[PDB]
């Protein structure tokens, strides 16, 4: 198959991992081999494990990235020292990892795999052949039984549980918390958020039969000083060993200062289990030269447009608290109810359906498109800034079409 066909092939794909496993087996066991960073979450998980790679990819390691969803294209979600797998390399991987599926359809007539769990195969496998220092590994949801729950990492990472996922990770945070302990390994340490005392309950008693070191935020490592700095943040981290001052990172967000916080944990811990150098320069230029693409990124100056992928109330909040924070002048809001909290903070608020979602009746100001909003808003006050918001779908949409 070509490239698009390849990927058309990826998403044509239909409760333990036996299946992975065996796909796995047949492709000689990647998993097994080299290093790991496991990381869950509700939220920020996809923030962390950025930041972790940024951090070790400036220690001079060679870091798989292994995140979802993707932004502009699929390849995104298999990257090497953030490169997105080219795409003749996917075509070959999937040719690969699709005659290793083929072959045990013959001796096993009826197997299959889901879509997720072909991706992380092939990723596994992928990490493997071009031997990569260590692989961060974004959990999909949840993480006991996770598709990419088949690997013994040297660090795991659960930044924070929420209710987001109860209709399949159950519905009490401690379920949903039992869910993610799941990654914690054996002796394997774990870095965390300051977890809910329901969450922060499951993992203390997961940690005591499991002898990890957990190091938490808020108690082991915190962010005792931040604040915002242009399109960015400058802060202070502060562990068991002492400060890093003034630390700068092109995210703002209040909650960012947690993820970030829990990355350079992970990334110390990672470097001291691995017997490798660590710097605080090292830590410096990661943070620094990192970037956060679709999250309350900035992608225009002129006219100043914002695209996010603000789901939850906590990220649109932090939004809203930020864009006041960031602007004092009217703005104008496309969204794609967090929505009578956008309205009631800015002058000119547009309600937009989300590209690639079926468009729904209103339940008992409003444009067709973003386009048609973002239209309007540059002929009306060519000046005015525009700040797209609401799913991350939307955000991505936006990007591809406007930096494409
Ligand atoms: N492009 C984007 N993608 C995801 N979350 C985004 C985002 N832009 C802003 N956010 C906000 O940042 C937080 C999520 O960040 P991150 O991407 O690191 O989470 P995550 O990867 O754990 C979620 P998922 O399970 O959907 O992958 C949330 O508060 C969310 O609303
Ligand atoms: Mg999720
Ligand atoms: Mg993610």
């Given at each position: 198959?070509?490239?698009?066909?390849?990927?058309?092939?990826?998403?044509?794909?239909?409760?333990?991992?036996?299946?992975?496993?065996?796909?796995?087996?047949?492709?000689?066991?990647?998993?097994?081999?080299?290093?790991?960073?496991?990381?869950?979450?509700?939220?920020?998980?996809?923030?962390?494990?950025?930041?972790?790679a940024?951090?070790?990819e400036?220690?001079?390691?060679?870091?798989?990235?292994y995140?979802?969803?993707?932004?502009?294209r699929?390849?995104?979600?298999?990257?090497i020292?953030?490169?997105?797998?080219p795409?003749?390399?996917?075509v070959?991987?999937?040719?690969?990892?699709?005659?290793?599926?083929?072959?045990?359809?013959?001796?096993?007539?009826?197997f299959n795999?889901?879509?997720?769990?072909?991706?992380?195969?092939?990723?596994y496998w992928?990490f493997?052949?071009?031997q990569?220092?260590?692989?961060?590994?974004?959990?999909?949801?949840g993480?006991?039984?996770?598709?990419?729950?088949?690997?013994?990492?040297?660090?795991?990472?659960?930044?924070?549980?929420?209710?987001?996922?109860?209709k399949?990770?159950?519905?009490?945070?401690?379920?949903?918390?039992k869910?993610?302990?799941?990654?914690?390994?054996?002796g394997?340490?774990?870095?965390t958020?300051?977890?809910?005392?329901?969450?922060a309950?499951?993992?203390?008693?997961?940690?005591?039969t499991?002898?990890?070191?957990?190091?938490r935020?808020?108690?082991?490592?915190?962010?005792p000083?931040a604040?915002?700095?242009?399109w960015?943040?400058?802060?202070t981290?502060?562990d068991?060993?002492?400060?890093?001052?003034?630390?700068?990172?092109?995210?703002?967000?209040?909650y960012?200062?947690?993820?970030?916080?829990?990355?350079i944990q992970?990334?110390?811990?990672?470097?001291?289990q691995?017997?490798?150098?660590?710097?605080?320069?090292?830590?410096?230029?990661g943070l620094?030269?990192?970037?956060?693409?679709?999250?309350?990124?900035?992608?225009?100056?002129?006219?100043?447009?914002v695209?996010?992928?603000?789901?939850?109330?906590?990220?649109?909040?932090?939004?809203?608290?930020?864009?006041?924070?960031?602007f004092?002048?009217?703005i104008?809001?496309?969204?794609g109810?967090?929505?009578?909290?956008?309205?009631?903070?800015?002058?000119?608020?547009?309600?937009?359906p989300?590209?690639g979602?079926?468009?729904?009746?209103?339940?008992?100001?409003?444009?067709?498109?973003?386009?048609?909003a973002?239209?309007?808003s540059?002929?009306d006050?060519?000046?005015?800034?525009?700040?797209?918001?609401?799913?991350?779908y939307?955000?991505?949409?936006?990007?591809?079409?406007?930096?494409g």
């Amino acid at each position: 198959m070509n490239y698009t066909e390849t990927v058309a092939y990826i998403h044509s794909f239909p409760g333990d991992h036996r299946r992975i496993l065996t796909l796995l087996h047949a492709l000689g066991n990647p998993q097994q081999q080299g290093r790991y960073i496991h990381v869950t979450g509700t939220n920020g998980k996809g923030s962390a494990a950025n930041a972790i790679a940024h951090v070790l990819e400036a220690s001079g390691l060679t870091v798989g990235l292994y995140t979802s969803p993707f932004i502009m294209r699929f390849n995104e979600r298999i990257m090497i020292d953030h490169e997105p797998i080219p795409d003749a390399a996917l075509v070959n991987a999937v040719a690969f990892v699709r005659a290793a599926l083929e072959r045990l359809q013959q001796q096993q007539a009826d197997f299959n795999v889901t879509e997720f769990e072909f991706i992380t195969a092939l990723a596994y496998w992928y990490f493997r052949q071009r031997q990569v220092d260590v692989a961060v590994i974004e959990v999909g949801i949840g993480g006991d039984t996770d598709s990419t729950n088949v690997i013994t990492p040297v660090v795991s990472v659960l930044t924070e549980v929420a209710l987001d996922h109860q209709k399949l990770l159950g519905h009490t945070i401690t379920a949903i918390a039992k869910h993610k302990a799941g990654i914690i390994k054996r002796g394997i340490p774990v870095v965390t958020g300051n977890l809910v005392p329901d969450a922060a309950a499951v993992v203390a008693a997961k940690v005591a039969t499991t002898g990890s070191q957990w190091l938490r935020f808020d108690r082991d490592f915190s962010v005792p000083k931040a604040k915002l700095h242009g399109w960015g943040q400058r802060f202070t981290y502060e562990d068991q060993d002492g400060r890093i001052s003034d630390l700068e990172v092109p995210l703002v967000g209040d909650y960012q200062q947690r993820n970030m916080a829990i990355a350079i944990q992970t990334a110390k811990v990672y470097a001291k289990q691995t017997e490798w150098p660590l710097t605080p320069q090292n830590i410096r230029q990661g943070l620094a030269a990192s970037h956060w693409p679709a999250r309350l990124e900035k992608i225009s100056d002129t006219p100043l447009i914002v695209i996010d992928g603000a789901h939850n109330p906590d990220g649109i909040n932090g939004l809203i608290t930020a864009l006041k924070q960031l602007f004092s002048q009217p703005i104008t809001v496309i969204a794609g109810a967090m929505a009578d909290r956008l309205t009631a903070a800015f002058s000119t608020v547009y309600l937009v359906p989300v590209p690639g979602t079926p468009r729904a009746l209103p339940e008992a100001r409003l444009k067709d498109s973003w386009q048609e909003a973002l239209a309007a808003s540059l002929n009306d006050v060519p000046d005015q800034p525009i700040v797209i918001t609401g799913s991350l779908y939307l955000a991505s949409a936006v990007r591809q079409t406007l930096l494409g």
